[PDB]
Amino acid sequence: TKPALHFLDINATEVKKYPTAIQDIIINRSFDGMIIRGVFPRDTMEQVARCLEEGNDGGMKSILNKNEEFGTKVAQIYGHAIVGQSPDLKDYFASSAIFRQACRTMFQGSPDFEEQVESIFHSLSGLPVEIPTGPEGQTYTPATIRLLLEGREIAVHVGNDFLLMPAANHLKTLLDLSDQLSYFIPLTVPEAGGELVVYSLEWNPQEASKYAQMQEYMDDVEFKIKSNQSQSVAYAPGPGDMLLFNGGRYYHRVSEVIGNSPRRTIGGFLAFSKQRDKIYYWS
Ligand SMILES: [Ca+2]
Ligand SMILES: [Ca+2]
Ligand code: NI
Ligand code: NI
Numbered sequence: 062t063k064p065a066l067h068f069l070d071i072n073a074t075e076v077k078k079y080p081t082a083i084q085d086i087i088i089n090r091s092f093d094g095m096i097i098r099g100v101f102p103r104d105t106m107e108q109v110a111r112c113l114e115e116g117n118d119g120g121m122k123s124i125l126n127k128n129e130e131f132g133t134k135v136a137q138i139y140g141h142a143i144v145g146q147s148p149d150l151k152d153y154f155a156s157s158a159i160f161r162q163a164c165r166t167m168f169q170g171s172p173d174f175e176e177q178v179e180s181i182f183h184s185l186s187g188l189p190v191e192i193p194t195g196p197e198g199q200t201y202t203p204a205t206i207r208l209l210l211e212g213r214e215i216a217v218h219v220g221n222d223f224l225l226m227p228a229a230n231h232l233k234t235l236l237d238l239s240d241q242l243s244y245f246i247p248l249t250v251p252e253a254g255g256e257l258v259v260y261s262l263e264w265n266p267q268e269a270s271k272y273a274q275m276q277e278y279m280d281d282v283e284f285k286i287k288s289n290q291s292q293s294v295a296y297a298p299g300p301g302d303m304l305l306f307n308g309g310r311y312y313h314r315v316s317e318v319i320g321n322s323p324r325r326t327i328g329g330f331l332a333f334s335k336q337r338d339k340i341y342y343w344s
Pocket of ligand 4: 280
């Protein structure tokens with residue numbers, strides 16, 4: 062045989078059968094991700110989406126970044142994502158406070174967003190699960206909400222590029238130097254498009270160094286991901302399903318949304334503490 066990408070497809074009721082799934086993806090590399098059906102009920106997802114559409118959102122609209130100047134290959138985002146922020150994190154910590162309050166209000170404890178996701182991550186690892194805190198106790202955000210309208214996409218990228226950004230300076234003191242995972246849950250799905258695609262092409266600073274400009278390297282990534290060479294797997298999770306996968310290691314993208322229903326997702330990242338005795342999750 063020739064090595065392939067491997068993913069599980071399970072129901073949320075079965076997570077306790079995989080008590081070392083996170084270690085198996087990050088450390089052992091025995092598989093690459095999983096889709097977990099029905100982490101949240103469909104009626105909870107619909108309620109949250111309606112809050113955002115109608116504006117009774119607990120203040121969430123006050124931290125919507127429309128990104129209007131950055132082209133069609135970016136989403137709009139509720140909350141500041143830590144990627145790209147200044148290393149002091151002052152703006153990020155303020156938006157993170159607002160995000161946690163607004164999210165808890167919208168979910169009405171039925172079930173609570175943080176409580177439910179932490180339960181999943183604990184069942185797949187056996188470890189305690191925490192949202193990190195800054196050097197003076199400021200909370201990170203557990204998640205951000207990505208909003209993709211008709212004609213918009215999420216350009217191909219890879220998670221371990223975060224380790225090369227000034228915004229990661231403080232988190233680097235808390236995390237093990239292994240792969241970060243990606244997680245997300247759809248609140249609303251589109252008529253067509255909006256598919257997550259994971260490629261076998263990996264993060265590779267050594268290959269990037271063969272190019273005088275990063276924009277030349279990314280032109281070659283775009284060539285490679287459309288060839289018969291790289292493998293690819295595609296998912297279109299329903300509302301309330303979680304996708305959990307090694308986005309730190311593998312290039313991935315979200316295809317252009319088609320139709321009049323927006324794609325809305327809530328999600329972030331997770332990684333090991335330096336002693337591999339705790340899981341941290343954030344966006
Ligand atoms: Ca499709
Ligand atoms: Ca339509
Ligand atoms: Ni990503
Ligand atoms: Ni080209």
